């Protein structure tokens, strides 16, 4: 039983991506202080406890599923698509999300507001003519007051429907007051859609749409995410735990039940001695 660890994560042979102050979802959305993680790839995304959000207050229904699938894909490669939003104002911003000195927003999301004095029924489409899945991250803006709702979206109650040939997903934004977060009582709800090859994405919305700017290229492989504060080191190790890298020569380990790579099986016993010699009978 291997019961001790070096306390550091070896950076080989696996591609380790240390997420400094950034969570995977914040790096996905395009949080300003996460801009260094654009187009990054990883075998293991190490997510630190010091990570925080510093953009528009948002909320992911089924956060764990999105985090799991993004981690499994193992890449943040983002392809910008040409979305034609007619009759609305693109690139909306906020002071809760300060990119540089001025107001900003998530780099992978497009906050569409009314243009002039109208907000038409947006109806856009993108086909998937590639041979890989496309991940689309979109949002719904929940305003704090009806005045804000009608000032951004002329409709008193918008809705956002994102659909493909096989499935659909509709969200009705709600207007209500919420806990103060970075200066705002409003929220963003983050939803995702996977468009399979040979399918089509149709986005039909009449208000409160945080539109996508493109798609994330979905992949399949050995990628995962881990919550650990262990520092990264320059060394070779096949088995990573939140406690650091551990040798895998022993068949069992007692360091941590969370593992990545060629790891020993986790057991509750802290020691198991295997006899490699005869029964010891000393003199006298």
């Amino acid at each position: 039983v291997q019961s001790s660890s070096t306390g550091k994560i070896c950076n080989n042979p696996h591609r380790i991506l240390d997420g400094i102050d950034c969570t995977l979802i914040d790096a996905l959305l395009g949080d300003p202080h996460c801009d260094v993680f654009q187009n990054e790839t990883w075998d293991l995304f190490v997510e630190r406890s010091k990570a925080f959000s510093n953009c528009y207050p948002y909320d992911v229904p089924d956060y764990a599923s999105l985090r799991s699938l993004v981690a499994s894909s193992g890449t943040l490669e983002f392809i910008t698509e040409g979305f034609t939003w007619t009759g609305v104002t693109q690139n909306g911003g906020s002071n809760a999300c300060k990119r540089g000195p001025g107001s900003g927003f998530f780099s992978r999301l497009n906050w569409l507001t009314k243009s002039g004095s109208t907000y038409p029924v947006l109806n856009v489409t993108m086909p998937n003519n590639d041979n890989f899945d496309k991940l689309y991250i979109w949002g719904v803006h929940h305003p704090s007051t009806n005045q804000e709702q009608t000032s951004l979206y002329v409709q008193a109650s918008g809705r956002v429907t994102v659909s493909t040939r096989r499935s659909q997903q509709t969200i009705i934004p709600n207007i209500g007051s919420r806990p103060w977060v970075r200066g705002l009582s409003s929220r963003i709800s983050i939803y995702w859609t996977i468009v399979k090859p040979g399918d089509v994405l149709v986005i039909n919305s009449n208000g409160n749409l945080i539109a996508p700017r493109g798609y994330f290229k979905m992949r399949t492989g050995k990628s995962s995410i881990m919550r650990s504060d262990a520092p990264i080191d320059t060394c070779i190790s096949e088995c990573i735990t939140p406690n650091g890298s551990i040798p895998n020569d022993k068949p069992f380990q007692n360091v941590n039940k969370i593992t990545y790579g060629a790891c020993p099986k986790y057991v509750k016993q802290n020691t198991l001695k295997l006899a490699t010699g005869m029964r010891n009978v000393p003199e006298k």
Partner: antibody
Amino acid sequence: QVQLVQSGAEVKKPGASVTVSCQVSGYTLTSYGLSWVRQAPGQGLEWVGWINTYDGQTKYVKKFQGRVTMTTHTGTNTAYMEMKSLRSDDTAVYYCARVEGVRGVMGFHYYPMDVWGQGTMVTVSS
Amino acid sequence: SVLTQPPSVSGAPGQRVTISCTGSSAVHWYQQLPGTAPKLLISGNSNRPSGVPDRFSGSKSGTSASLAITGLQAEDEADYYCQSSVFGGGTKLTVLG
């Protein structure tokens, strides 16, 4: 900004117990561990101990085992260090300092104390 | 794991200062200005934290770390500690005329 505001000066009597509080601001208390460091007046810094916020496991110097207890109040983002059976040599300025690791490792093995409190002068003698 | 370092480096403003902590076993360097809380100024073993001028530098041999302050002035002069738990003895920085 990140700040650790400590309590006021405590003037105690030998054999009593004292409690020093550290109110953290600008971040979530459970995102970082917290070390407590003593400095006797003009005698250099002395590490007292370490509280792992988010799971409550402690680490104390053997000199302080049994007579020091560190706790946290997540509701108010506060951390408390209580020293029982006070002695004369415990007269010192006590600092709370922010350390990074809480999950997977004990942070003080690998990370520094980047943010410090203003210190409370706990004087137990006259 | 006893840490040691050479105390009471006395010097005028504007030149080299070298402090040497010999770990007997991650060493970080803290500055305590008089009547102020200690401030971290060398993370890792050679890394500088945010807001600390590039004048400060750290260097690690096999078991000896050294902190170098360049062009020191009034605020650079303080009491300096190495940390690895254990602190160093402490070396005072004083101005010289």
